[PDB]
């Protein structure tokens with residue numbers, strides 16, 4: 001029995017940037033008041049996790065990364081009311097405190113208790129529940145899902161359907177919800193519209209799914225890796241284009257293809273240049289462009305504000321604009337009710353011990369989502 | 375007595391950047407098919423007209439500028455159906471052709487026949503109606519209102535109430551409608567919200583008017599000229615701040631004053647730095663920032679896209695987002711019914727012949743709107 005005790009378990013510790021994860025024993029403290037300790041079942045490999053490795057994202061190291069996952073509650077601290085031992089749960093890398101001005105706002109989801117903006121790599125109380133070889137190890141986004149067991153604040157976990165297949169619904173913890181919500185909630189794609197989606201990984205495919213669900217008439221996938229095109233078309237892309245095939249800048253190509261600019265464009269890569277291209281390719285008077293990708297830390301883009309003065313709207317969002325704790329259970333219920341599919345996003349399923357091989361599949365271009373199973 | 379004949383009249387010709395206007399005789403050709411020749415009655419001095427002088431806005435020279443005006447139809451060309459001789463009219467610097475994809479879109483107003491994006495300085499047919507000293511003179515935005523007579527395309531004129539006071543309603547041809555619409559239509563300011571308005575000239579005052587009409591609880595005016603604050607408070611500002619009074623950047627000041635960022639911000643100046651400041655000062659998860667000011671020609675801003683990724687919305691608009699020909703007559707009718715006031719914007723009245731003194735008043739910081747009478 002483990003409740004109230006330190007757990008010694010296996011985790012993937014990142015000791016320094018640009019090195020492999022080290023799969024080794026860590027100690028996981030029991031949960032304090034308003035904390036939840038979770039036995040992990042499945043975690044996806046998101047490009048944002050690779051950004052920690054590459055230094056694209058800056059977060060305190062050493063760290064247990066991972067933020068797209070699902071598991072089963074092992075124990076709860078004093079005062080927890082929203083989950084119980086045995087519950088299926090998804091950790092929420094964007095918390096929902098319910099109390100801050102953002103949580104109270106009808107359209108806000110980026111709760112002020114987040115650990116993204118100015119990452120501390122801790123629990124809400126500024127301490128860590130992890131040690132390894134006698135050293136304290138940082139959390140990541142309040143989730144740290146690359147571990148057999150994690151501890152999360154209550155505001156960073158959602159109870160989901162007891163009958164949920166956790167090896168699929170883990171994707172609702174980041175990539176599916178982010179892409180789908182970017183289309184249906186943030187952009188509010190309209191019926192009959194033309195969309196352009198830059199980047200055809202797990203998140204961009206989920207954007208396509210949302211554009212198709214919203215009734216778009218045309219959905220143009222854009223990627224430099226043409227191997228990504230067949231699955232993009234399967235989930236709703238009507239056309240795919242590779243910028244490398246053209247002598248013209250792709251914003252010009254997309255403006256021509258759409259007879260004057262697209263209704264909705266999405267940057268789902270993480271490059272400054274594609275963010276400006278994606279804005280430019282939306283119609284100048286009424287187009288909307290949504291930034292989803294995460295670019296290199298502390299780098300500014302350059303753009304001409306006339307792109308906005310003519311009437312364009314430029315926005316971004318974390319986690320598809322979804323209020324995390326309200327939305328995740330409903331997304332899982334909708335998945336159980338066959339309202340969307342997750343299988344098209346899953347290209348590989350590996351044991352957790354093969355985490356490095358899963359990252360190499362992402363980096364080589366082969367995979368969409370690898371699901372790691374504990 | 376003049377229908378079908380060349381009219382000799384006075385106009386204010388700009389032969390060279392950074393020079394006074396030359397009040398001198400021009401020849402105004404009669405209207406061709408689907409053209410309207412207007413006897414001007416009143417025209418306002420908008421900062422955008424000054425941009426032509428300063429080279430902030432690049433348009434072919436020599437030119438007859440002016441775009442905020444009202445007058446009476448002298449004659450119509452073949453096939454005109456929407457105005458008649460003797461009608462009161464406002465020239466529309468943003469046309470409404472009614473046929474293009476933007477005019478057909480429920481939220482578009484930047485009609486594809488505009489002469490703003492890539493100015494030619496002509497009529498729609500690529501020619502000029504103006505001669506001076508035997509030389510062809512450019513039009514400006516299809517309107518060229520700094521002339522006793524102008525010729526406009528039919529898509530660039532709206533018929534307005536016969537009982538309109540033209541010395542007031544000229545402001546509906548640019549500054550009032552731009553500012554008011556930027557608040558009520560583009561930003562969609564909400565009841566109880568906090569707004570920040572950068573720049574307290576005629577357009578920023580009109581933004582304040584709209585934010586107050588929308589029910590904002592707090593309207594923070596921002597200007598480096600504290601002489602602008604009294605009138606800003608008269609039309610609805612709850613408080614005014616001068617960035618020069620503060621050690622810290624004003625985005626930080628406004629974030630503090632609004633307990634974490636404003637709901638709505640407006641850039642109503644025309645500086646790259648204040649466009650980025652205005653974005654930064656709106657709440658990071660659900661704030662909206664609207665660019666209204668005209669940026670200097672061909673210059674790019676630098677910004678960190680993390681400002682958008684957290685959830686901000688950034689947009690801009692021409693003419694307050696109003697479809698020009700549908701909206702201008704309705705705005706005049708609402709003015710007639712006292713639904714908004716124009717007198718607070720009018721600080722000076724001069725005869726047309728004193729146009730250069732009018733520009734001096736704007737450049738000195740003294741005026742809001744000078745109205746010129748023909």
Ligand SMILES: NC(=O)c1ccc[n+]([C@@H]2O[C@H](COP(=O)([O-])OP(=O)([O-])OC[C@H]3O[C@@H](n4cnc5c(N)[nH+]cnc54)[C@H](O)[C@@H]3O)[C@@H](O)[C@H]2O)c1
Nearest residue numbers: 047048178199201202203223224225269270293294318319
């Ligand atoms: N906003 C959020 O909440 C959120 C959530 C999840 C992921 N992300 C970010 O979204 C991005 C995509 O994540 P993912 O789908 O897991 O990544 P991914 O699976 O690596 O997909 C990225 C795709 O972009 C393609 N690509 C690379 N360069 C270009 C180019 N120049 N032009 C066109 N295509 C190009 C690439 O071939 C690949 O198919 C990353 O930056 C993530 O960090 C953000």
Ligand SMILES: NC(=O)c1ccc[n+]([C@@H]2O[C@H](COP(=O)([O-])OP(=O)([O-])OC[C@H]3O[C@@H](n4cnc5c(N)[nH+]cnc54)[C@H](O)[C@@H]3O)[C@@H](O)[C@H]2O)c1
Nearest residue numbers: 421422552573575576577597598599643644667668692693
């Ligand atoms: N988008 C449109 O359709 C549209 C319409 C009309 C005007 N404009 C533009 O809107 C802007 C304002 O026009 P306007 O009201 O006639 O001009 P204005 O009367 O010159 O007002 C601008 C105000 O900005 C103030 N200002 C200058 N620099 C700063 C600073 N650094 N910080 C804070 N305040 C500062 C200045 O003191 C003045 O009161 C100009 O750039 C116009 O070209 C755009």
Ligand SMILES: OCc1c(F)c(F)c(F)c(F)c1F
Nearest residue numbers: 046048057067116174294318
């Ligand atoms: O993939 C989701 C995700 C983000 F969108 C970020 F902006 C980020 F910083 C991060 F760490 C992350 F995991």
Ligand SMILES: OCc1c(F)c(F)c(F)c(F)c1F
Nearest residue numbers: 420422431441490548668692
């Ligand atoms: O003041 C209205 C106004 C604008 F908003 C412009 F963008 C512009 F180019 C111009 F010439 C103009 F007059």
Ligand SMILES: [Zn+2]
Nearest residue numbers: 046048174175
């Ligand atoms: Zn992610």
Ligand SMILES: [Zn+2]
Nearest residue numbers: 097100103111
């Ligand atoms: Zn919150």
Ligand SMILES: [Zn+2]
Nearest residue numbers: 471474477485
């Ligand atoms: Zn049109």
Ligand SMILES: [Zn+2]
Nearest residue numbers: 420422548549
């Ligand atoms: Zn103007």
